[PDB]
Amino acid sequence: PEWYKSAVFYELSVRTFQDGNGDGKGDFPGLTSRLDYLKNLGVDCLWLLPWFPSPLRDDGYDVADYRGIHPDLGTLDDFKVFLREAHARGLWVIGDLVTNHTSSDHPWFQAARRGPTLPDGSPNEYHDYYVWSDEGKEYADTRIIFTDTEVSNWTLDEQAGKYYWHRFFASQPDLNYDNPKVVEELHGAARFWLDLGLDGFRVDAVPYLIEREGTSCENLPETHEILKGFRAMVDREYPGRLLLAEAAQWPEEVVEYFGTEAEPEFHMCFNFPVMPRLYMSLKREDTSSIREIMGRLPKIPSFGQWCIFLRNHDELTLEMVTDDERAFMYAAYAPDARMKINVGIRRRLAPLLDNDRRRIELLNTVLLALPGSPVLYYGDEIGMGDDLGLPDRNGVRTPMQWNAGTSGGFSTAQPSDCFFPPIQDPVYGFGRVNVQSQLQDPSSLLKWTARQLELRRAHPAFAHGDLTFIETGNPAILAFTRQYDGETLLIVSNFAGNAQAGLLDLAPFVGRAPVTLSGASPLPVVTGNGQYPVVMGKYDYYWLRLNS
Amino acid sequence: PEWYKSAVFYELSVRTFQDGNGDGKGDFPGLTSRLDYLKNLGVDCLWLLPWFPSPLRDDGYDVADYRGIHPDLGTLDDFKVFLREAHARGLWVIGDLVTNHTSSDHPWFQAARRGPTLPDGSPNEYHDYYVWSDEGKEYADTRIIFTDTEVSNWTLDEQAGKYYWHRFFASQPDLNYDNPKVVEELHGAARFWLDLGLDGFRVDAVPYLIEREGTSCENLPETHEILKGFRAMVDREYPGRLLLAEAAQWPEEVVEYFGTEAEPEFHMCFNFPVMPRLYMSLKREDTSSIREIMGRLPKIPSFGQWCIFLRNHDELTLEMVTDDERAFMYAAYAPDARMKINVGIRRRLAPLLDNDRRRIELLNTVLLALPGSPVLYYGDEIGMGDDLGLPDRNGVRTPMQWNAGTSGGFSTAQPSDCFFPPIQDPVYGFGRVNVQSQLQDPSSLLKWTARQLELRRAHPAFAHGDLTFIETGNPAILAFTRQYDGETLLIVSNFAGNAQAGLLDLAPFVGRAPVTLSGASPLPVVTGNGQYPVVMGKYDYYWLRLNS
Ligand SMILES: [Ca+2]
Ligand SMILES: [Ca+2]
Ligand SMILES: [Mg+2]
Ligand SMILES: [Mg+2]
């Protein structure tokens, strides 16, 4: 199978991982100096947030130059050294390709805003790189994504005297994919990095490329067409590289981003649909929403693999759940107003779960056991918290906590000189939560996570198996099998905070002998009608093999 | 009904708990400021280590004055205010009555060593307070308790020109209980504290009062007779006060220390027999030793209550297990030979259990679920570590860790000026393990402990019920009922580190449903032959009641 199917991904922000030069900003030399940590954790692929020059109004997702390294992060040479060192350790690396929009500081937009013709009457070739309007009335009733900042998807530019489209901040003007030149520019950006040996891209905001009058301006066939263009380019010119889509949409919309066997699109898509139902099922002590949303996911192509995740650098998005699920989620996971942003919840995993290690482990087990390749958000493996005093979504992007020394080991500069301040509170601060402590503590979360990955790695059915949900007679207990190449796994998870009984329907496995993956402790052989009783402790996870 | 049967005890050392004035030494005004913490935790009775003037060669168990407060700890006025403040909050307080021996700095012994006659020719009345010998040849083949330090139970006093007896350090000369004045002096010392309102005593080293030639000089009938005299004195003069015995002896010798209905002795005795079997069963993944040692304990009198404990200010003693068991325990729990002392292991609870919170909870639940009144060792409720850099047993006696401030909040004195240095290592240090963190952390060990005590408190069967072991079909799974006043609890505990299947013998409860004590979730009703299948995750504890 393709490499990305067997990978474990790790998401990090270079500016926030390791400062290698004392200026309070993370950088590539710093990242390079920490690759053994990632190697030894059990990670195979690093996904780096945007590393491009940018005034950072959306933390680098406002790109000013696609073919450069932001000066905070070092130089292109540093980037090539990093990539060489990552590759030498068996780490693949993917970048973040921001296709839908650029910074307003990008030279193209600086050019475009002069208007349709240059001062001397000549056509301004860059004007058409962006999406302009006389009165900002096209595409009405299309949704606003950054609901807490933007009141419209059109903003008046003072210099051009016309409106320009933007699905995100006003400082992120949308690119005009009806202009063939724009398409070519982004194929070119992609080539630049793939020519350096980058293993692929996470592609940002894929559903919003094309706008059409009388549509939602999301998931349009025309957008898919373009994305297939990217795939074909990579298949012809860079065989084996990964395209991974950020498509935060309903199940049936998301699965379209894989394309077809005849017309391939992405290799991978994040499982956005399952992610909120994990947190919901935990609070409701009822896992039906997980089965229901997985059941709405169509079959994907041969080459396709889901990318499973718990959290990421953004808020926990609630955009694609119902109004009642959303309200439930806010009540359960955002009791203070400042915890919410833009139709979502800007908190880290450990805080979301009351720092309850039994729950954190539970959800990580499900992360690793569902069909796909999992992605860890940096620092969740040590139980980092958040800083909701920081604006926007920056409170989940505080510096990695390496040790208890100056600024959590992130930098030799003092905390208050760090790009974002390293967490110091009594619960989650680097005094208490840091890699070094957890390397010495035999029972740490760091250790637990590396061990759980090693356990996953010893059973390829987690990465490659099919999935079948098993009836349990108790909504609190989730059970499924993963089968691949002669091994059947049975995964049984209790989402309730107290002990629970179930009656598993193991009819198809009469005469099979369940044993724990860890140590092969035997459970009773399945007999009779195969209705198999279980009890589980609070937040328990049973990882089993059904010997044939 | 008697208060001590319903109490949760907490063992602490005043010198090591809270320093109020900043000299590096814990004191009474300091302890007084922390009474709300102990109350809120769910503690009812404080047992304080010896608070008496002493040169501290055995950390205060070498008493130089039975009727004062050691200057380190404040004044007798401080003690009274402390006692008033504890009672004001509905706490009980017991002290540590050191009956077997005094410090060699005690004036009695300073007098005694001058010999039978004073310089004025008069007889020396203090000489017979201690146990003298011309050649130290009596009582040979008595066990030496401090095996790592002492070569003999006799030591030649150079002034007296004679040998004196000591079961502990040579600086702890044994008192002569065949002298009736000695008995009266210790009745008087007891009176002194009981008249101030002290609620009782923990009585130190009770098996060793009387020596007799041709015996082991432990547990002799004459020693029990003396102890019965303390009980009579208390029952007549101070009804309701507690006498708790430290007798580290085999089951049938320990039970002797309760006395009988007709001839009462101690109200409570520490359950030394079960303590080492908890740890051994965890590492063996086999609980049969717990059932065997509990089964070997005779019924105790009506007024009697066991005091159950996991650890204390001493080493985990292995003196009263078999050679095979001892070798097993050393291998499992003393990987470094420095961790051994006096036929036991000088480590704290959390380190012993590899800081595994799942195991720490399991053993704590077992401690709370077995018959008796539990005693918690200060700092175990936050997961304190140990410091083997300190001599003797002092490595488990480091200052309590309140916050991440100056010396873990124990003192404004620097760590190196504290009586014992606060732990500062990366795993257990005060930056990582402290009260204030755990008060803010919704899922801390501290909160967990408070909540589990609350749960225990809501079910009087734990404090007062009978006990009946239940067949499980799996030695890893321990199961028992506790029955009292119309309620039957069912407590099931997995001592293995992976999932285990069981088949519980619940034939006596066909037609009843087990339900969780926590959150009232019912489990399937018992039916048919009452053989009840369970599965348990690693180190799970199921606290259930059996409904009608
Ligand atoms: Ca667009
Ligand atoms: Ca004696
Ligand atoms: Mg830097
Ligand atoms: Mg002091």
Author numbering:
A (entry chain A), B (entry chain D): 6 to 553
In the authors' words:
The four or eight subunits in each asymmetric unit did not display significant differences, with root-mean-square deviations of 0.3–0.4 Å for all Cα atoms. The peak was assigned as a Tris from the crystallization solution, which contained 300 mM Tris–HCl, forming hydrogen bonds to Asp63, His106, Asp209, Glu251 and Arg398. In addition, the interaction networks between subdomains B and S7 seal the active-site entrance. Disruption of such networks through the replacement of Arg148 and Asn253 with alanine resulted in a decrease in isomerase activity by 8–9-fold and an increased hydrolase activity by 1.5–1.8-fold. The N253A structure showed a small pore created for water entry. In the N253A mutant, disruption of the interaction between Asn253 and Glu324 results in movement of the Glu324 side chain to create a small pore for solvent entry to the active site. This may explain why the N253A mutant has ∼11% of the isomerase activity and ∼180% of the hydrolase activity of the wild type. Similar to N253A, the R148A mutant shows ∼12% of the isomerase activity and ∼150% of the hydrolase activity of the wild type, suggesting that a small pore for water entry may also be present when Arg148 is replaced by alanine.
Trehalose synthase (TS) catalyzes the reversible conversion of the inexpensive maltose into trehalose in the absence of any coenzyme. DrTS consists of a catalytic (β/α)8 barrel, subdomain B, a C-terminal β domain and two TS-unique subdomains (S7 and S8). Domain C and sub­domain S8 contribute to dimer formation, while subdomains B and S7 serve as a gateway for the opening and closing of the active site. In the present study, we have determined crystal structures of the wild type and the N253A mutant of TS from Deinococcus radiodurans (DrTS) that reveal a closed conformation for intramolecular isomerization.
